[PDB]
Symmetry: D2
Subunit: 234 residues, 4 copies
């Protein structure tokens, strides 16, 4: 194929990853809840599947679309929720989207990737998660972001070990402060101030830097069961 | 001093409750059942029926605690107790099961902590250094989806520990987590329980719930333990 | 016996641990490079062995003293070096004392403890390490303290697993900022300022709090292969 | 741009050197031998004989690098290369052996980093964001004392990574660590090498030194990677 599914692929980290994957020659299904126009503009090697990652039936239909395009081998979980702004229902929503959704997509995708022929015939595929944190202290919902981050981190090695016999690697990127629309509710000088708190480089991460790491992980067969912090040492 | 122990009517929570009662705390046992168990514990223990994800029911358990005395201690053992029995009894083989397990562990622990902290923050300190202490339990360990639900739940509880400790520091409430390995609780045949014990390096046996309770009391009694996860697992 | 060996036992964390152990009914060999007077004052259930922990022959002779007193079952590595003050030789000295010394004492003690009868006949003994950090940023020798800390942390689980068949637990305490003579070169208000940086409790740790944890570890059979941070969330 | 690769004449260091040469860097190979290897690498590689714990010899390797161009990159692979061959060839069964292994890993890496950083801090930045990047290797894995020396060495290198990254941030020098698992280097019979490969979950084979080199180059090329340890080990 090779086909990738990128959740949250129509913006931020997901979009940057989608573009890097297209550049690398893969086809991509953008699994997201909006941004059909953005994905249309990328051309017909990227396709849009409308799906909430917490909805099993919706995810399954997006994987079906990927299968029509070629051989499914790659997943990148970049779906997130909640703008950074200065409720048990709110806690639950963040955990459901960032943690449960990532598991849903990982498990359903793994089932299909496991059925493919390996490509020296060593690998069937690679699943990459995103472990996301709160942007700042006293950020609303910090405990939920820390919980869903910890959950994604915690499942990385155990799932890698369970999928080893299927030749599917499982990795996680833990980004720091990145320039995405999730920061767009803060005023500009606030975002600039956040960037300057990062030790080095003292700025916001560019989503392309996340996308570049994701591609490196896909291209490096020895990276498995690991979390990689991508955060300027913050 | 009053404690609330969730999952307090069995296993780790019961062992904790007993240690707390012997140390002079009164205890509200917050659980889905166990009225007889709590009756057998005598006059310094009271029972509150509650699902840890139910805000009103947890609030009422806290109200009960504050009727008995000054609420200073919470130990969240619901993730290992009666509450996960059904969520696990017939196995964990679906995305819906994974979700329910994550819910009780992450949402349940967050609900109990957030509501308890609100009450404890309003108490007077006891060198007038401490208002209280909240201890979480990072899920006890079934198959692959079961392994994932455990590992995600454990991870999430771990992940919240330091950030919440930091948030509550100005309120003089410590936040700690115990991450137990294989323990001998009603949750678990003798041969099958024997095999589990053998994969623990040393001691090569199931943990005694009293060993969990002893650590919980030590955490309570050691002012410098904050924002940390303590694995209690025989190096497994 | 039971006999404990506490390295650095004549001051700070080590002394507080020695006193807690005596109170708990153990006999103690204080393995240290000075403080014979302090140990004399504790009475004849504490004995002094003059030894540098980097010197194998010296350590062995201290273990010999412990054996004459009773059955050796407990080791607490609290020997440290260098006052906190605001050189490759200096880097090497910190690593040699804090990391190599701890390994030296652990390995030599383990050999003897392994030969004892277990005491329901589950345990032969317990070895506790101290993983110490720099007190503040820009502290001279910070990289060496971080290296020797990381080294002690890194060896904890692997050594616990290798000693499991001998029924010897191996644990590590990672203290934060404690009121010991290692801070005595900083002026008082500087130490007070450091204490206030600790989130909660916002003060310097009391060495007795370390000693209490060490005793709890000894008394809790399920604690093995783990590092416990004791640091007020700093 | 000039790089210094310690242990650069074999294994992980050689694979890194080759990747760097293909990416357009000149490379000083700092090693205890390998003049012929470096000659075969051609005119953009030069050889400096040095023990990584020898301040004068490392200083001279740095002098050589700065003669060739602007020093921006250091990759410390000496802990996995020619330098540990003898320290390990006849086994690790003494406290003196443990010490020597810790020395080369912790002291060696600190010596190279501290001296390299002093030079790199004085260069002009290249959006004028970066002066340079230093990458450490957290020991490759023999028996119990061997296991302890490995684990302590790895731990120490890991432990220094973030604090040093923080210290060097104002100088625009990133500090990263790669923690490799079982790799196929000259250090390692086919059957015995086969058995080692099988205990890696996936890929269930020894790592190819080129996979280490590819990660090192990615770290160099990704401005946001700082203060972090990356395990490269097939989930072992
Ligand atoms: Na811990
Ligand atoms: Na990592």
């Amino acid at each position: 194929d090779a086909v990738a599914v990128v959740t949250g692929g129509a913006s931020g980290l997901g979009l940057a990853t989608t573009k890097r994957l297209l550049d690398a020659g893969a086809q991509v299904v953008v699994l997201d809840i909006r941004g059909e126009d953005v994905v249309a503009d990328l051309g017909d090697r990227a396709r849009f599947a409308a799906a909430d990652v917490t909805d099993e039936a919706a995810v399954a239909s997006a994987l079906d679309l990927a299968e029509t395009m070629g051989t499914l081998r790659i997943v990148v979980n970049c779906a997130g929720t909640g703008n950074a702004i200065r409720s048990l229902a709110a806690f639950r929503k963040i955990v459901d989207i960032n943690l449960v959704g990532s598991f849903n997509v990982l498990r359903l995708a793994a089932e299909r990737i496991a059925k493919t022929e390996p490509v020296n015939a060593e690998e069937r595929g690679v699943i990459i998660n995103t472990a996301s944190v709160a942007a700042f202290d006293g950020q609303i919902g910090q405990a939920a972001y820390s919980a869903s981050k910890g959950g994604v981190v915690g499942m990385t090695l155990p799932i890698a070990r369970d999928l080893a016999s299927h030749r599917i690697r499982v990795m996680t990127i833990a980004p720091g402060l990145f320039d995405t629309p999730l920061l767009a509710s803060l005023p500009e000088e606030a975002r600039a101030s956040l960037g300057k708190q990062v030790p080095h480089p003292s700025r916001l991460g560019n989503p392309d830097e996340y996308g570049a790491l994701a591609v490196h992980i896909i291209e490096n067969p020895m990276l498995n069961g690991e979390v990689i912090r991508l955060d300027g040492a913050i």
